[PDB]
Every structure is written in C-alpha cells, then in structure tokens.
Amino acid sequence: QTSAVQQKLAALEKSSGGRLGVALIDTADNTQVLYRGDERFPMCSTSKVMAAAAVLKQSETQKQLLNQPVEIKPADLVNYNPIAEKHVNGTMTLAELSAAALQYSDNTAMNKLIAQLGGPGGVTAFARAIGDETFRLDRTEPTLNTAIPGDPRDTTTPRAMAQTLRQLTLGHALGETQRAQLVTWLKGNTTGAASIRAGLPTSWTVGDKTGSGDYGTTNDIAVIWPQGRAPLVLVTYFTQPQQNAESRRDVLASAARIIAEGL
Numbered sequence: 001q002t003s004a005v006q007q008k009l010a011a012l013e014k015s016s017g018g019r020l021g022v023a024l025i026d027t028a029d030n031t032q033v034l035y036r037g038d039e040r041f042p043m044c045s046t047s048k049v050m051a052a053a054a055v056l057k058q059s060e061t062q063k064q065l066l067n068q069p070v071e072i073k074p075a076d077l078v079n080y081n082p083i084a085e086k087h088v089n090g091t092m093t094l095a096e097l098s099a100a101a102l103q104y105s106d107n108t109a110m111n112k113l114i115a116q117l118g119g120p121g122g123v124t125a126f127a128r129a130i131g132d133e134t135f136r137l138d139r140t141e142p143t144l145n146t147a148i149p150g151d152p153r154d155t156t157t158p159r160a161m162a163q164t165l166r167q168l169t170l171g172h173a174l175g176e177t178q179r180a181q182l183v184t185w186l187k188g189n190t191t192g193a194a195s196i197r198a199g200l201p202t203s204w205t206v207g208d209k210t211g212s213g214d215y216g217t218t219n220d221i222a223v224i225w226p227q228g229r230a231p232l233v234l235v236t237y238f239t240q241p242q243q244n245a246e247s248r249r250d251v252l253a254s255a256a257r258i259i260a261e262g263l
Ligand SMILES: O=C(O)C[C@@H]1CC[C@H](NC(=O)Cc2cccs2)[B-](O)(O)O1
Pocket: 078, 079, 080, 212
C-alpha cells in the first residue's frame, strides 16, 4: 500500500528533483513508516555514528580506552578538521575524537576512529555484530563522501540505519553507560538545526548526526523525544543527480515535518 504520508513524501521528492529516503520507527508501538526504505544511499558523515559506537563497544572491556591519547600529525589533516587541527603535533583522546567526529563532524577525528577499529571494515564488522547486515563502510575520509549514484561503497538503507540507531540509542546494542554517552553526544550536536530538527515542533528534543557529500547528498539521522509520547527514530537521506549539486537541508526538514504531521 501507499499511505498518505508516503504520497506526501513522493510529492516533496518530485518537487526537489532528487532522491529521498526516509525511515521512521515510532517506539510508541514499534511501527514504521518507510519511503524508499530499502534503497541504498551514501551515508557520508552520518557514518560517524557507527564508528563512534564501535569504539564505545570496545570501551566496555577497557575502562581507560576513551582516555587513550592518539597522535595528530600535520599529514593527518584532510578537508574538514576544525577540532583536530588545534591538536596537530599533539594528541586527542578517543573520547575527544568521538565528540569531535559526532558534534563537529571532524573528518580527521573520524579517520582516527576508523584506524582504532582496524580500517573501514572494522566499522562494518561492528554493524554486523549488532544485527545490521546492510551497512558497509569501505573507505576513509574524505573519499567515503564521493556519493556516486549506483556506487555501493559507503552506503546503507534507511530501514537498516533506523533499526541500528534505535538499538544503539534506545536499545541494548551498547552497555548502559555507553548508550548514555552516545545519547549525550548526539544531543549536543552543533550541526543539526536546519535538518530534521527544523521540521519538528520546537518543544521536542533531538539528538542527531548530519552528513554532506558530493551529488548534493544531504543526510540526517536522529533520535527524537517528542512532548507527550515515546521516542522516535528518524532517518532522512537525500541525493541528487549532478555531482556539484547544492546541499538541501530544507528537504530533510520538509520530510520530518510530513512525518510529524502524520503521527
Ligand atoms: O574550494 C576551495 O577554494 C578550497 C576548499 C576549502 C575548504 C573546503 N572544505 C570544506 O568546506 C569542508 C566542508 C564542510 C561541510 C561540507 S564540506 B575544501 O577542503 O573542500 O576545499
């Protein structure tokens, strides 16, 4: 079937000229709303959640892991490093790298998380360990954001990412203190106010991770605590036909507004 919400998302997509993917889980009843929910999209910086979570999982058996210093060298800087560049020729702890990757979208920080996990495949292995058979990370920063149409590298589906984000933040994929740390980090994101957040009532609380890539790829994955009801998990992925397309965070806000109006 096609619901009223799905028809509105299709109209938004048609007007946008791009390709939109949405997955909602409403934990009030465990129901789902999907739009292109099983199509693949390039994750771009939303992949930073999986990398940080994989390090949190490692930290469950190493009380000092998050305090471990990691050297930052001039050669480690890439294309977007606002936190890591302040620590060149110094160090950042794994907690600092996680916070920088999640809350500031720092790409050097992400590369250090990936390296701590043994490369992109270590992030994929963690996804598999927590029940996600869809996610794949294949490259480091910055090339994981090329977002080429039809390329399977560094992709997932909306359905898979919503399920995984639920298990990480509201379920038991992580230990209790690690889940709480991930939620704290997401709630302190600096980059999200134009994306899913912008389509929701102002009284609701959001923790999210955005991403930007080539092909105008504009993404957001969020946990949402609405006023008066159980939490939601919402993924909104958007990608466009031209490599140089502009970001369209407003489309994500519009998708979130349609979802919220359908509850
Ligand atoms: O064109 C130029 O004169 C050089 C630019 C300068 C900085 C650029 N980097 C970014 O803007 C980081 C991003 C943040 C969010 C989306 S991209 B670049 O390193 O790509 O090259």
